């Protein structure tokens, strides 16, 4: 029945996207209640390593032009928190969904709503690596694009794009202003730290394969979780903790978690020219919940 990377519907996030303009630089922002969150990098202009406490002294609210669509918003006061600005605007956003602020942990997925000039352009599925980065697709004007998780009818905002460390590797800040990983909003060299293949996601992806015809890799041998973590230190894999969703997936398919872990180790050294859901490499970008909702819902 097919396995893809899905995205959360964007209807509750789009009405919250605004543009923030200082000087001539324009980036994106998020409008919730009477606050507007956007990167502090909007007040710089002078390249390289800005002096943000020094630049704040000259900035006044009247020089921010925040616009939702074609409507103009007036900034009362502002506040630098970490690496973001929390702008307080006159207007209470009428389309503010029930929301909360969260922090994604490595291996967990979310949806990025890519925006330019305060205008949404598209959305895509991303996974937070052990390097506290994401494999996204961003250009100039994309900072401030938000990453979020849909939770019933509530939106848990988790990500604000800010930085491209290297080709195809990005990161940004949570909505407390703190960067994901040991990075910072400066144009100095910050190549990412070591990354690991997300084991829990690879386990879930193989359960999806089992529920989708492909189960040839399943054998009677089994490798415990704690015996896997000692092997994972030296083969580029992350540590794995027990999981209901994996237990639920295990119960549905009739294959224990320990069989999947043992199948992972054998397949770490070649897929033998065979394919798993049309793939020749592990897929670690689908959480257990992502897989379960595409097997049942």
């Amino acid at each position: 029945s097919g396995i893809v990377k899905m995205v959360s519907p964007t209807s509750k996030v789009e009405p919250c996207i605004v543009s923030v303009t200082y000087g001539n630089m324009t980036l994106n922002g998020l409008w919730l209640d009477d606050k507007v969150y956007c990167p502090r990098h909007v007040i710089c202009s002078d390249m390289t390593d800005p002096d943000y406490p020094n630049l704040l002294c000259r900035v006044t609210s009247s020089d921010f032009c925040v616009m939702s669509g074609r409507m103009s918003l007036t900034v009362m006061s502002y506040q630098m928190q970490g690496c973001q600005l929390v702008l307080t605007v006159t207007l209470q956003n009428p389309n503010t969904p029930k929301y909360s602020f969260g922090v994604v942990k490595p291996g967990e997925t979310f949806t990025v709503l890519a925006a330019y000039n305060g205008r949404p352009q598209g959305a895509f599925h991303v996974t937070l690596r052990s390097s506290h980065t994401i494999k996204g697709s961003f250009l100039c004007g994309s900072c401030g694009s938000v990453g979020y998780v849909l939770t019933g009818d509530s939106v848990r905002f988790v990500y604000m794009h800010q930085l491209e460390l290297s080709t195809g590797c990005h990161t940004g800040t949570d909505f407390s202003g703190n960067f994901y990983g040991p990075y910072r909003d400066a144009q100095v060299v910050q190549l990412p730290v070591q990354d690991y293949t997300q084991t829990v996601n690879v386990v879930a992806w193989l359960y999806a394969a089992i529920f989708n015809r492909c189960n040839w890799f399943v054998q009677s041998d089994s490798c415990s979780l704690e015996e896997f973590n000692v092997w994972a230190m030296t083969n580029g894999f992350s540590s794995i903790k027990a999981d209901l969703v994996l237990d639920a997936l295990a119960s549905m398919t009739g294959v224990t978690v320990e069989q999947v872990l043992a199948a992972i180790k054998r397949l770490h050294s070649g897929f033998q020219g065979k394919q798993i859901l049309g793939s020749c490499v592990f897929e670690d970008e689908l959480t257990p919940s992502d897989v379960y909702q595409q097997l049942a819902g």
Binding site: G136, L163, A186, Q187, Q190
Partner: peptide, 5 residues
């Protein structure tokens, strides 16, 4: 070297 978006 890292690019600010």
């Amino acid at each position: 070297x890292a690019v600010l978006x």
